[PDB]
Amino acid sequence: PPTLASLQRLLWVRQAATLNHIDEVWPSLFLGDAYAARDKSKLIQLGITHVVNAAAGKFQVDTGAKFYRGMSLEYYGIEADDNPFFDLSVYFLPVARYIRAALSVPQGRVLVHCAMGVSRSATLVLAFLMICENMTLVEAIQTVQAHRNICPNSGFLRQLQVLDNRLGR
């Protein structure tokens, strides 16, 4: 039963020197920022077929389905705030189902992006790994941080920590 303080240490302790705009943190599952989400060329190059925008809203990254009209990808917008009291857990299961289905397809290439692809987005991926990949919160973080510096809100961590106890049983 990892403590919150522990999880935080784990996150900061093993960080790489730099952070790219996007990284494949799991086979065909990418974590990225708003710069990558708006770069259509890049998305076409990586063959992205699905985009989960965890920072939707006209006051955040207002891309939306319209933005990808030409490309033939699936859009999933989530109006989430990145503060420790926002309830992101309510999207853990529906997003995990969404990722799973997308990755069950040969072409399937999923990009989960935040404004910085380090908190909201990362939290959804961790939830996906825990739920569909049978990983504990610890294993999930280890899996992802080996490919991208991530740092979910202390609140998101608390939520993931609660998910971990639920899945554990």
UniProtKB/Swiss-Prot annotation:
Q: In which tissues is it expressed?
A: Highly expressed in the testis (at protein level). Also found in the skeletal muscle.
* Documented EC number(s): 3.1.3.16, 3.1.3.48
* Residue ranges the record marks as coiled coil: none
Catalytic residues (UniProt): 114
Question: From which residue to which does the signal peptide run?
Answer: none
Gene3D superfamilies given in the database record: Protein tyrosine phosphatase superfamily
Q: Which reaction does it catalyse?
A: O-phospho-L-tyrosyl-[protein] + H2O = L-tyrosyl-[protein] + phosphate; O-phospho-L-seryl-[protein] + H2O = L-seryl-[protein] + phosphate; O-phospho-L-threonyl-[protein] + H2O = L-threonyl-[protein] + phosphate
**Which CDD domains does this UniProt record tie to the protein?**
DUSP13B
| Matches recorded under InterPro entries | Atypical_DUSP_subfamA (IPR020405), Dual-sp_phosphatase_cat-dom (IPR000340), Prot-tyrosine_phosphatase-like (IPR029021), Tyr_Pase_AS (IPR016130), Tyr_Pase_dom (IPR000387), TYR_PHOSPHATASE_DUAL_dom (IPR020422)
Q: What class of enzyme is it?
A: hydrolase
What's a single GO BP term from this record?
Answer: dephosphorylation
**Molecular function GO labels:** MAP kinase phosphatase activity; phosphatase activity; protein serine/threonine phosphatase activity; protein tyrosine phosphatase activity; protein tyrosine/serine/threonine phosphatase activity
Task: Note one Pfam family from the annotation.
Answer: DSPc
Keywords, alphabetical: Hydrolase, Protein phosphatase
Q: Which domain of life is it from?
A: Eukaryota
Entry-linked PROSITE patterns: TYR_PHOSPHATASE_1, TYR_PHOSPHATASE_2, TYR_PHOSPHATASE_DUAL
Gene Ontology terms: cellular component: cytoplasm
Domain spans labelled Tyrosine-protein phosphatase: 21-169
Q: Which family does it belong to?
A: Belongs to the protein-tyrosine phosphatase family. Non-receptor class dual specificity subfamily.
List the PANTHER family: AGAP008228-PA (PTHR45682), DUAL SPECIFICITY PROTEIN PHOSPHATASE 13 ISOFORM B (PTHR45682:SF10)
Q: What does this protein do?
A: Dual specificity phosphatase that dephosphorylates MAPK8/JNK and MAPK14/p38, but not MAPK1/ERK2, in vitro. Exhibits intrinsic phosphatase activity towards both phospho-seryl/threonyl and -tyrosyl residues, with similar specific activities in vitro.
What is the name attached to this protein's record?
Answer: Dual specificity protein phosphatase 13B
The lineage is: Eukaryota, Metazoa, Chordata, Craniata, Vertebrata
